[PDB]
Design an enzyme around this catalytic site. Sequence first.
Site, PDB file in Angstrom:
ATOM      1  N   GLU B  62       0.838  -1.188   0.000  1.00 34.41           N
ATOM      2  CA  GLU B  62       0.000   0.000   0.000  1.00 34.41           C
ATOM      3  C   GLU B  62       0.880   1.248   0.000  1.00 34.41           C
ATOM      4  N   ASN B 197       6.061  -5.218  20.710  1.00 36.00           N
ATOM      5  CA  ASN B 197       5.422  -3.910  20.761  1.00 36.00           C
ATOM      6  C   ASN B 197       4.850  -3.588  22.135  1.00 36.00           C
ATOM      7  N   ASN B 219       9.723   3.865  18.322  1.00 36.32           N
ATOM      8  CA  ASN B 219      10.570   3.646  17.157  1.00 36.32           C
ATOM      9  C   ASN B 219      11.992   4.133  17.371  1.00 36.32           C
ATOM     10  N   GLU B 245      30.872 -12.071  12.695  1.00 34.50           N
ATOM     11  CA  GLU B 245      31.199 -12.291  14.101  1.00 34.50           C
ATOM     12  C   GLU B 245      29.950 -12.580  14.915  1.00 34.50           C
TER      13      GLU B 245
END
Lengths: 96, 430, 41, 426
Positions: B62, B197, B219, B245
């Site tokens: 979208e 979340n 965020n 690593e």
Amino acid sequence: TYDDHYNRHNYNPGLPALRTWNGQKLLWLPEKSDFPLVAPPTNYGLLEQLQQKWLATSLKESIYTTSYPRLPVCAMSRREHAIPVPHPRLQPIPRF
Amino acid sequence: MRECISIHVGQAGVQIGNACWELYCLEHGIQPDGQMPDSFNTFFSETGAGKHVPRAVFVDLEPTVIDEVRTGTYRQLFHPEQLITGKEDAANNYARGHYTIGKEIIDLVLDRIRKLADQCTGLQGFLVFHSFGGGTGSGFTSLLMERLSVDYGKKSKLEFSIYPAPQVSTAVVEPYNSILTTHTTLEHSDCAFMVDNEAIYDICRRNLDIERPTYTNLNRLIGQIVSSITASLRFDGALNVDLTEFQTNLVPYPRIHFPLATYAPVISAEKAYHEQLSVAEITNACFEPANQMVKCDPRHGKYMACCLLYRGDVVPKDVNAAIATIKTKRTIQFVDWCPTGFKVGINYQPPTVVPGGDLAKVQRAVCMLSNTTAIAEAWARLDHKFDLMYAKRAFVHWYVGEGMEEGEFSEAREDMAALEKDYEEVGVDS
Amino acid sequence: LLYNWEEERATNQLDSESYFFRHGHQGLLTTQPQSPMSSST
Amino acid sequence: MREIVHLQAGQCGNQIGAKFWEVISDEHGIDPTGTYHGDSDLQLERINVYYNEATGGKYVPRAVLVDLEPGTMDSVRSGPFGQIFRPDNFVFGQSGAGNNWAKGHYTEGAELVDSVLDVVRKEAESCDCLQGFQLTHSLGGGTGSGMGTLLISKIREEYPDRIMNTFSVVPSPKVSDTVVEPYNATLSVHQLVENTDETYCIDNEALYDICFRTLKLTTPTYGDLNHLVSATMSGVTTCLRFPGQLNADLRKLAVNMVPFPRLHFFMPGFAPLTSRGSQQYRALTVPELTQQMFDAKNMMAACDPRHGRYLTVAAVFRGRMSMKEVDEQMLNVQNKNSSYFVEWIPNNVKTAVCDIPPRGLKMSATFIGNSTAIQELFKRISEQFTAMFRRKAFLHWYTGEGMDEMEFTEAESNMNDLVSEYQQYQ
């Protein structure tokens, strides 16, 4: 939300550093409580473009007149890399 | 000449890549125009007039959040074709994700990857950012790990993916598409990090005091774990890491590759100067169960392989005298096949704060990317929900009507049978 | 005069802290600059 | 006349050799712009051991500097000593090894030895008479233990006559920094015993002790633990480089010390260590040096020497000295603690004497020693290995790059039978 948090850089008249802890309600409000609403809304230049397309003596025009006008006097190419003509070029000046 | 091209996909990947690619603007001298008024070359490429253009691909089907990047001041920095836009969504389904809608925007992605890696002379891996529980990241990313593991082959790949929240969930059909994207990742990946979340709303309420936070309040927090993972290519230090690593020191087995993230210093601006941020407390933050970025307790299970990516004043002595007391305690358990256990990496640059952020300027940051056998509990609650609605065949008709069959239902449960069979056999002692 | 009082106070006059001293400190030598050019065999 | 070819690998090595190559710049009076500005004339005598000649009086070393990633030799050029190290002697790769052995031993460090061996075989045939070799490298990493053990393997295949020495950075047994230390350090010491004659094992847990309780620094870096390692390197060759009372070279302590082909795992040391603040209260004399280097808290690997008996013990000295007073001190440390030596060798101690002490010292010494209590440096790794082999803990990394499990299974049958020779004599 993109325009407020990212491009806008956030609220202006609020407290820049201070977050004061109040008396009665148990809370650090003066950053959270604002929920910024500063200034004009999100303007970015689309009403301008569609306005010049919306609002309008060339109706009577041949394309050779519109698409081929006289260009400006200064857009002419400078010939930087061209064999200089002050010394005449090698040419068979013997006419035989 | 040690570049990294990283992939964000979906509705999350543009929401994160707006707040993940904002440090890389901020910590070099990079304007959001694209100009600078040479550690930047892992993420910024010179043009013939000083302009820096990045090297990441952001995909959503979208176009409704990608065009928000095109509105603001993050447009001239980004490249016009480097952001791929469709017209419709996949609408919380894996059939639209993997077969129909995933098949037309897949050959416009791979023009740009094959142009990105053919200018990268030092690319070492891939970094992925997709959602288990959506329509795009469940499916469009699932096609890519099928499609990129045949083109470029044996390169490293890691993902910091958004796991479903444990108690609350937003969209209801997720215990289908979360199970359904799992048979396509255990054999086409190498190191699957999980974040949650809901499990950071707890963090911003008890460490920070901010009540009611936004996605853009969550965020930037996950956006600093990323800058502590690229923090070895990017700067100088005593002992440095790379993308090989990571998993050579983290994943032991073919099919157990699920580590867990934790970021140590979380505190407000005002409360930092009343408290002492010694290296003892910073390494004693990531071993508390109230600091994990999923809602799980390590007290049930057993650690297997850890990591430590310090920054700033590591002072390797007092770090060594801080791991040495973690090894003492009996609350922290391990398995006898890993008597060594740890990894230390070091960088010199202390972390950088954004304007209008919610963390302070901290001089010592720790990420701890460790795996545990207590994700096997967390899989089961996401795997208990499956036959609770397969028995009634609840939402199944959205799936047959876009190319898939009911046999992908029959085996993706059976793949979770032998995955969680494996974790019980690795968690047992010799 | 906390823990390690004397030496940390004394060493500063004779001698970004980690970044400056990342190459090292003059530990195994005297404070005097030169004891070369000894024709002493 | 007897030059030294130096090898380097890893990023663990190239912080140490960057600190090794500055005390050589200190003692030979070399400024960091390539020239020479020392006030002596004996320092310019045997300059050729570490300083090849060029135009303008420039002296640039015999240095090899290698890694598989470009991220480390950017910083070595960006140190305090940038102009001295040779630009053609930075051999580089693109991909880091990442704590794995076959990334450097079989695939990515293996394709790159044909450019290192071009550098060495050109350079080593520019020496008029080489004495031998030396290496400082990581057993802990993937480049030093992976790639560098090939360079110990393949160069010894070319010239079998010279002497291999190793400033091994062996891992600590207590606190570990990598979860594959019982593989990269286990497999590397499978090829050290057929190939290498001098093996100096160094621990950082052993060296975090010394810069706190002896030098009294509360904030130690690597660069102030690298210098004590860089002290003992130039503290070995003190007698080849300068005149004195009894000169000795690197064949003279590989004969006095190692009575067998496989008992050659040394134990390093350094004598005169005292605080920075209290430097001028001690009397830097002969009894002060010997009383420190015969102790457990002046030892550069993390094993207590009191749990076994030294087979052989070397030394070297420097500075103007009275040789009978050392001779009184060496019999006392053979007559008093006679239970800390084996009874089946008559003489166990060697000494050798230089003439000029370092810049700022008067009396210097360096301790090199064979000891059979280095088993606890190897049994801890050898018991870490089988606690994860039996759970097959990381074998999918190793099989998927060109190894077997029969290259794994025999790498502890060497490591067991190594200790199954040291055990009888103690």
